[PDB]
Design a protein around this nucleic acid. Structure first.
Ligand SMILES: Nc1nc2c(ncn2[C@@H]2O[C@H](COP(=O)(O)OP(=O)(O)OP(=O)(O)O)[C@@H](O)[C@H]2O)c(=O)[nH]1
Lengths: 593, 82, 403
RNA sequence: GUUCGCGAACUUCGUGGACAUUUGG
RNA sequence: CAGCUUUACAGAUCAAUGGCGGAGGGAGGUCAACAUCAAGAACUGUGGGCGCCUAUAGAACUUAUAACGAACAUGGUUCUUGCCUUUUACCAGAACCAUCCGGGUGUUGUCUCCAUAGAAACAGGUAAAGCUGUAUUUUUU
């Protein structure tokens, strides 16, 4: 026992002494702090200055924990500075992926229904508030009327019985049970019927046709081949040629006009399907597949396990004998599940960020080009290109220490983990962001120009050349400002939703508008034009959605389903945060090296 | 079913030795065996109980009248028992 | 001399049966079936061979986690980059394995996995030339295509013993979702077609020739095999052959321990449909659908095979696969069927004559061996040679001819 | 979304283009 | 309906020998700090534990391939398009490094629920759980 004790001691005191885990404080405290900060209006402390460095990261985090249309209010954990600054979300959002998909499908359905119903659909006006004034809000939000009915379609007790009690909830639910790991919410497990139900719910959204043969010459390998042959497919994408286009054949003894017989047209389609035969000199061209044909039946009828549309042929109990009648009540849909695409063919899995879980991907890989308009086709192609290039150049990371956790741990001055309404948090961030910008301005040449509370910076008066020279500042700063504005816009829509004179449907729609129009609503492209690529992608996604959405007689401004756009935005933010952070650091470390 | 029978079956091909009730040992390639040890053998020598030996081609023997069968020692290894 | 050999042995997957025994067996003929597994494109013959390999070995090196689970195949005889990247088994990249039978008569089998795809009949042809028996394999669904018919024709010519493998039952249970009766009918039709394609021999589930399989899930059975596993319990030994015979064809069985009157009363579903296909269907449903505990209980009762604690937490397709492996054991039934098919050695002489004119052999004074195909198994070239007569030792100074 | 063109009943549907930005004051 | 082991036991003597260990928890948490990351791990080394497991570390070869992550954004140098001219800022493709955003694995701690002996078996008896079981030519009438 003594020896054991000694060993334990050795294990302990050698490395890593106990740093105490700090408690989860009240939101009231946070609010008070914020109020105090507001009252103060500059301080310019060192700690405060230091903390400002991580604002774009904070913004990104906030964006990631956006409340989905099915959620009333994303109650979210947060880190916040003793001052009342840099008040950023802690938790990573994540989801049971098939469940998430189901939820999304439900939302889509609801949106469709709304479209069908309402005639004069009042779209959201932007920017939502008077930028000249400073209309922020906290107390009002807190003691407001009940957050009115969010977007979840009504489920019948017969068909989707196993989900309706839990499906639409924050985490989402199935959160407290044997069906997950626990509240950490990393590994999910399921029974069959629930899974089946989820799949059914999804179908509206994710009808990916998973006859592997469907994707003949639309597999990533095939696309790669096409790229590295400078070859194309009417529906597929096209690139720069990957090697130098230097033919100069010189019509030799071999490959003359009068030697060969041009009997086959030898289209582009062939060249990628048989890379080594039809194309001569295939440098870096992967070997594609060649699979078998599918026999299947997928139906939505009462009867089960029958020949529907086949061709008819010519002409001691056995070991289970009334244990069973050959079909159980679930096996109708069990078979379907078994046949399915990734998410559902499995009854257990790992959970993923929801900024993962691409629900677009499966549509824009699915070779649509018949009876659509040309713009849509173009968009699809663009999407494919975006995908394909990414696939071609993957990325590998390694060992790392994450920033939020570090701050939680080592830093005082932080209080931590105050469960705030997400909207409140967003508002705080917006306020804080604005403050930060002002601080930055002060640090630089003190300007004539002033920020709108909705971030649209502009000069007050007294416009001169010298002034202009002084106050050009950086593109980085403007990018940051743009980002902040975007956040405000999304946050502001949520705020609007929370108060009256709005709708939940409008909320989602508003969000969609915001994301799928950055180009219109706020120019980042002005300062960083790689954001234009992102914008283009978003537009393409929107286009894809709209045709997909509006197969029915509905055609107009009302349509949510912001997910893929949101994801794209998040990705962009991720790409950009580090540079922004660096810039901020540089700005703060102006006097010193 | 009998594991000795199985063993015998396995020994098919191999050169088994084989004594009867009479006490007349044989040694030959085991051609075929059945559940009742109804052995056939090829290229088979035949010792008399007294001493003298006689070569013979394709002997059949009925297991009833068989006493004991010696199989080659390779079959010890595998793969019948487990 | 020995050290090198030892090294070679070391760089290899340790087989569950002792390879020494196999070697010993090989010293004797008639304990060596040479089997060409052949069929149309994507029959699932390579997959089947994979199953056999798995059964043979303890643990395979590049058998991934996913493949173990039963997601992707592990086509163990695909080998070269070309093939794994492409999807098609392309060259005759076979394997040798000891295999016990129903009644455990070990026999060292020289499997050669043909290519299906028709532009590789070369490899198929080679296999045919080599192999005295041929497992024809067929997709249930795709049916006996013209390709298969052609193969059959050009296996009668060679000549060879023709076991069949109606592979891809899962496809009719889960893809087509044929009722059990319908499935049975389909099977019968297929059998009829096969027979028609054939001249002399009749093939059926009785007389061990059909081998019903689904390699994705990874079960083969013959009817005899099934009986052995799951109908010795309930019938006295003497009437087992009879039962087996009854099982196939236009036959019905009413509540009567133990008759079994051909035809008939009220609720149909034939003997085969009642005692085989229906059971399979049930297993499938339960595996996918049922409350897991109840399924487990059933499998304890009606099959005496235990769904383990780790296995219970599987996903469906894998779970189903596991269940079927538990049921129909490491594929001995197939081997038994093969054995039944191969006459043996009445045919063999004829085959050899066909290969190389009629005449008379010479065992002791010489050896001769058909160098069948050059290959690239271990990077470097080998010649896949079949030794017909004599014994060809290492280092031996040898004659040859390109034909 | 914002302009220009064309088809059908200024107004609206069907549609083909074009739509960065600041430093050099 | 027979047998053997395995728990509950009665009351043993009490060896005896086994086994049980001479006792050290099982969970989880958007709790941390620390390593180590395609899985591989062949084959070798060197440990525990018996021609072989379990740990380690060393390359080999694997395929990576689709998915440490069914995710995908951003930098920099160089080469090549192209804006063109110039600065950012970029168009659009390569090569090699880097950057975030996430991820597991074990090591440990810490914080809230579930637990809970300090030994038990021999000789069999009781109760349950698990495996093996009819004479007329080839085995035992
Ligand atoms: N549904 C179903 N699919 C199967 C079955 N057997 C095989 N498959 C699948 O269909 C394909 C056929 O298996 P393979 O092993 O590739 O076929 P193969 O024998 O290699 O064909 P060749 O390369 O031409 O010899 C694989 O993708 C398998 O996963 C089955 O029984 N049911």
């Amino acid at each position: 026992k003594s020896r054991k004790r000694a060993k334990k001691m050795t294990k302990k005191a050698k490395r890593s002494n106990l740093y105490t885990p700090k408690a989860e404080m009240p939101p009231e405290h946070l609010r008070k702090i914020i109020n105090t900060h507001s009252d103060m209006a500059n301080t310019d402390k060192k700690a405060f200055l230091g903390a400002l460095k991580y604002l774009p990261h904070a913004i990104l985090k906030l964006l990631e924990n956006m409340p989905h249309p099915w959620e009333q209010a994303k109650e979210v954990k947060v880190l916040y500075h003793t001052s009342g600054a840099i008040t950023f979300v802690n938790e990573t959002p994540r989801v049971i992926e098939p469940v998430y998909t189901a939820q999304w499908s439900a939302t889509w359905i609801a949106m469709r229904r709304e479209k069908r119903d309402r005639t004069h659909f009042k779209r959201m006006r932007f920017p939502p508030f008077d930028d000249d004034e400073p209309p922020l809000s906290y107390e009002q939000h807190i003691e407001n009327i009940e957050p009115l009915d969010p977007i979840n379609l009504p489920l019948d007790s017969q068909d989707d019985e196993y989900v309706k009690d839990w499906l639409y909830d924050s985490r989402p639910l199935e959160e407290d049970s044997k069906k997950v790991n626990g509240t950490s919410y990393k590994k999910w497990s399921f029974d069959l019927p629930e899974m089946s139900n989820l799949y059914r719910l999804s179908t509206p959204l994710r009808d990916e046709v998973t006859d592997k043969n469907y994707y003949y010459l639309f597999d990533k390998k095939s696309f790669f081949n096409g790229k590295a042959l400078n070859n194309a497919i009417p529906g597929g994408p096209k690139f720069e040629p990957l090697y130098p286009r230097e033919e100069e054949e010189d019509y030799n003894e071999f490959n003359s006009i009068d030697r060969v017989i041009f009997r086959v047209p030898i289209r582009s389609e062939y060249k990628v399907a048989f890379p080594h035969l039809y194309n001569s000199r295939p440098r870096s061209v992967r070997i594609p597949w060649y699979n078998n044909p599918v026999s299947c039946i997928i139906q939505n009828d009462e009867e089960y396990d029958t020949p529907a549309l086949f061709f008819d042929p010519s002409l001691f109990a056995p070991l289970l004998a009334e244990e069973e009648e050959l079909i159980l009540p679930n096996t109708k849909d069990a078979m379907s599940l078994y046949h399915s695409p990734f998410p559902f063919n499995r009854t257990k899995g790992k959970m993923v960020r929801a900024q993962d879980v691409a629900l677009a991907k499966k549509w824009f890989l699915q070779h649509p080009d018949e009876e659509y308009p040309v713009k849509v086709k173009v968009s699809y192609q663009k999407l494919l290109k975006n995908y394909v290039l990414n696939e071609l150049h993957p990325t590998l990371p390694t060992n790392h220490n994450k920033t939020k956790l570090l701050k939680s741990l080592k830093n005082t001055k932080y209080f931590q983990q105050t469960t705030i309404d997400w909207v409140e948090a967003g508002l705080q961030l917006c306020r804080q962001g604005h403050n930060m910008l002002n601080l930055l301005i002060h640090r630089k040449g003190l300007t004539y120009l002033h920020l709108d509370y909705n971030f649209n910076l502009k000069p007050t008066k007294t416009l001169t050349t010298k002034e202009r020279k002084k106050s050009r500042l950086g593109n980085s700063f403007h990018l940051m400002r743009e980002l902040l504005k975007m956040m405000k816009l999304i946050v502001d829509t949520h705020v609007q939703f929370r108060l009256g004179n709005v709708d939940a449907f409008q909320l989602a729609d508003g969000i969609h508008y915001i994301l799928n129009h950055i180009g219109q609503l706020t120019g980042i492209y002005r300062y960083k034009y790689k954001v234009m690529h992102q914008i283009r992608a978003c537009k393409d996604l929107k286009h894809i959605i709209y045709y997909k959405f509006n197969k029915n007689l509905g055609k107009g401004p009302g349509c949510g389903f912001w997910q893929p756009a949101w994801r794209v935005w998040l990705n962009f933010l991720r790409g950009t945060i580090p540079l922004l952070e660096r810039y901020i650091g540089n700005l703060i470390t102006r006097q010193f090296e | 079913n009998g594991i000795p029978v199985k063993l015998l079956n396995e020994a098919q091909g191999h050169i088994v030795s084989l004594e009867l009730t009479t006490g007349a040992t044989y040694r030959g390639k085991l051609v075929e065996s059945e559940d009742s040890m109804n052995v056939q053998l090829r290229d088979v020598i035949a010792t008399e109980p007294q001493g003298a030996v006689t070569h013979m081609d394709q002997i059949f023997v009925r297991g009833s009248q068989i006493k004991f069968i010696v199989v080659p020692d390779l079959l010890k290894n595998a793969p019948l028992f487990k | 001399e020995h050290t090198i050999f030892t090294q070679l042995k070391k760089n290899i997957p340790k087989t569950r049966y002792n390879r020494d025994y196999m070697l010993s067996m090989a010293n004797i003929p008639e304990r060596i079936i040479n089997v060409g597994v052949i069929g149309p494109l994507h029959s699932g013959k390579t997959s089947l061979m994979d199953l056999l390999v798995i059964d043979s070995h303890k643990r395979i090196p590049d058998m991934s986690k996913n493949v173990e689970l039963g997601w992707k195949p592990l086509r163990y005889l695909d080998n070269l980059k070309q093939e794994i990247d492409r999807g098609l088994s392309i060259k005759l990249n076979g394997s040798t394995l000891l295999c016990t039978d129903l009644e455990s008569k070990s026999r060292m089998i020289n499997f050669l996995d043909a290519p299906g795809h028709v532009n590789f009949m070369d490899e198929t042809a080679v296999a045919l030339a080599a192999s005295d028996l041929v497992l024809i394999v067929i997709d249930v669904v795709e049916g006996v295509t013209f390709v298969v018919e052609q193969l059959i024709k050009q296996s009668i010519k060679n000549n060879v013993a023709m076991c069949f493998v109606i592979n891809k039952l899962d496809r009719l249970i889960l893809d087509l979702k044929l009722p059990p009766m319908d499935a049975y009918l389909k099977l019968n039709h297929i059998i009829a077609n096969i027979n028609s394609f054939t001249k002399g021999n009749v093939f059926s589930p009785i007389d061990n020739n059909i081998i019903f399989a689904s390699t994705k899930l990874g079960f083969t059975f013959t009817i005899k095999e099934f009986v052995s596993y799951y109908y010795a319990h309930s019938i006295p030994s003497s009437k087992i052959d009879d039962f087996t015979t009854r099982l196939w064809g236009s036959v019905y069985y009413h509540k009567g321990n133990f008759r079994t009157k051909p035809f008939e009363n009220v609720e149909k579903y034939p003997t085969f449909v009642e005692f085989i296909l229906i059971p399979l269907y049930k297993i499938f449903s339960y595996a996918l659908s049922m409350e897991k505990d109840k399924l487990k209980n059933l499998l304890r009762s009606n099959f005496r095979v235990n769904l383990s604690q780790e296995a219970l937490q599987y996903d469906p397709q894998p779970f189903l696969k596991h269940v079927l492996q538990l049921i129909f054991r490491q594929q001995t039934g197939l081997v038994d069927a093969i054995t039944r098919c191969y006459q043996p050695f009445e045919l063999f002489d004829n085959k050899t004559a066909h290969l190389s004119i009629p005449g008379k052999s010479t065992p002791e004074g010489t050896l001769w061996a058909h160098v069948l195909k050059t290959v690239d198994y271990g990077g470097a070239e080998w010649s896949l040679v079949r030794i017909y007569s004599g014994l060809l030792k290492r280092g031996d100074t040898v004659r040859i001819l390109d034909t």
